[PDB]
Design an enzyme around this catalytic site. Structure first.
Site, mmCIF file in Angstrom:
data_model
loop_
_atom_site.group_PDB
_atom_site.id
_atom_site.type_symbol
_atom_site.label_atom_id
_atom_site.label_comp_id
_atom_site.label_asym_id
_atom_site.label_seq_id
_atom_site.Cartn_x
_atom_site.Cartn_y
_atom_site.Cartn_z
ATOM 1 N N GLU A 149 0.802 -1.241 0.000
ATOM 2 C CA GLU A 149 0.000 0.000 0.000
ATOM 3 C C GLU A 149 0.830 1.285 0.000
ATOM 4 O O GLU A 149 0.535 2.227 0.715
ATOM 5 C CB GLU A 149 -0.978 -0.034 1.203
ATOM 6 C CG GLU A 149 -1.860 -1.241 1.118
ATOM 7 C CD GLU A 149 -2.931 -1.279 2.218
ATOM 8 O OE1 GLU A 149 -2.965 -0.332 3.118
ATOM 9 O OE2 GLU A 149 -3.652 -2.318 2.188
ATOM 10 N N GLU A 259 -5.435 -11.078 -1.784
ATOM 11 C CA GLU A 259 -6.312 -10.953 -0.577
ATOM 12 C C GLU A 259 -7.814 -10.991 -0.934
ATOM 13 O O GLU A 259 -8.598 -10.211 -0.467
ATOM 14 C CB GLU A 259 -5.974 -9.695 0.247
ATOM 15 C CG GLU A 259 -4.494 -9.395 0.399
ATOM 16 C CD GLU A 259 -4.196 -8.218 1.312
ATOM 17 O OE1 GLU A 259 -5.124 -7.575 1.847
ATOM 18 O OE2 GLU A 259 -2.990 -7.909 1.406
#
Ligand SMILES: [Mg+2]
Ligand code: NA
Length: 354
Positions: A149, A259
């Site tokens: 991220e 994910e």
């Protein structure tokens, strides 16, 4: 009633010509029914939480390996591949990284020379964390989320980098350092990933694309893009997903879906169904249609996609429930997987096994 997950054909077997099928796990999920589902269906695992920075080095020089080691030992005993999540993140990271030698936050410093001294200190700390962790696990890990991220959802600076403490202190240098150090210690063959969410949607997709091109031109070792895929039933579109993975493949980068969960709710996720039994069967069918299209696409892209990991096992355990509760005054239940809270298959399972 729908049969138990261990009574149906294995997802990993179904997809063995295409990509690994993975799950995120905690140590307590390695046994009991969760462990039985895991062993039946999956040939890759990742730590939901035990390998995050704060999980491994909660104080400076104090390393806590028990949970991470359990997961590694399970992968070894069960012949599973193992993703490492994650060397660098702005969440679940201990605050000691970001304090100057007087014990104050580095982001507060206003003397530029001191900021440069801080940058070197933080980068050295990051090198030590990566070295230590990598040297422990380098023979077990098959894909490293080296950074997580780092790209913004907006455009707060020209390169679209997230302005976390890492960026405020080091600019992009933490990213370069992270990959270089992972390569150095893990070996020439270790697969190094940049992982993010919303990799299918702009401007983020394109900030990411530019970043990987920039780092690659500069000789920074990057092997692949991790697509978190925290998706919904209607968004992002199939073509958005396809374009993003093709874009990265065009750079010679691998793709992994890291994910995956298919939420029942858009943003904001309210009103949520309050309990699992309140969710109407029609919603599970809409989910199954989505999953069907998704997995058709992943199969279509299988020359460019090596692994597909769900962010959990069955519907009894998902951060999506936290998200649902957060937006509905403490009440709400999501159901993102192809296995139900009792480990029984859902409509979505049948639509991805065929
Ligand atoms: Mg199907
Ligand atoms: Na593949």
């Amino acid at each position: 009633l729908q049969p138990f997950a261990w009574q149906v054909a294995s997802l990993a077997d179904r997809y063995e010509e295409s990509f690994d099928i993975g799950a995120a796990v905690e140590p307590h999920q390695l046994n009991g029914r969760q462990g039985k589902v895991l062993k039946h269906h999956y040939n890759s695992i990742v730590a939901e939480n035990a390998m995050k920075p704060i999980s491994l080095q909660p104080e400076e020089g104090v390393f806590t390996w028990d949970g991470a080691d359990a997961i590694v030992e399970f992968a070894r005993k069960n012949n599973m591949n193992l993703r490492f999540h994650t060397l660098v993140w702005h969440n679940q990271v201990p605050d000691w990284f970001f304090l100057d030698e007087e014990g104050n936050p580095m982001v507060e410093e206003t003397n530029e020379a001191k900021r440069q001294a801080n940058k070197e200190l933080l980068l050295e700390r990051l090198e030590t964390h990566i070295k230590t962790v990598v040297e422990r696990y380098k023979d077990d890990v098959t894909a490293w989320d080296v950074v997580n991220e780092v790209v913004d959802d907006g455009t707060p600076n020209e390169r679209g980098l997230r302005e976390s403490v890492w960026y405020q202190i080091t600019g992009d240098e933490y990213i370069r350092v992270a990959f270089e150090t992972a390569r150095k210690y893990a070996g020439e063959d270790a697969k190094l990933f940049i992982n993010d969410y919303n990799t299918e949607v702009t401007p983020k997709r394109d900030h990411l694309y530019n970043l990987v091109q920039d780092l690659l031109a500069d000789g920074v070792p990057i092997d692949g893009v991790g697509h978190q895929a925290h998706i919904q039933i209607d968004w992002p579109t199939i073509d958005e997903i396809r374009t993003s993975m093709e874009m990265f493949a065009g750079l010679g980068l691998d793709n992994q879906v890291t994910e995956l969960d298919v939420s029942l709710y858009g943003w904001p996720p309210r009103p949520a169904f309050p309990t699992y039994d309140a969710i109407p069967q029609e919603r599970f069918q809409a989910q199954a249609d989505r999953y069907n299209q998704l997995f058709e696409l992943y199969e279509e892209l299988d020359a460019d996609l090596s692994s597909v990991t769900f962010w959990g096992i069955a519907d009894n355990h998902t951060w999506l429930d936290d998200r649902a509760r957060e937006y509905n005054d403490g009440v709400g239940k999501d159901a993102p997987f192809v296995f139900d809270p009792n480990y029984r298959v859902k409509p979505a399972f049948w639509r991805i096994i065929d």
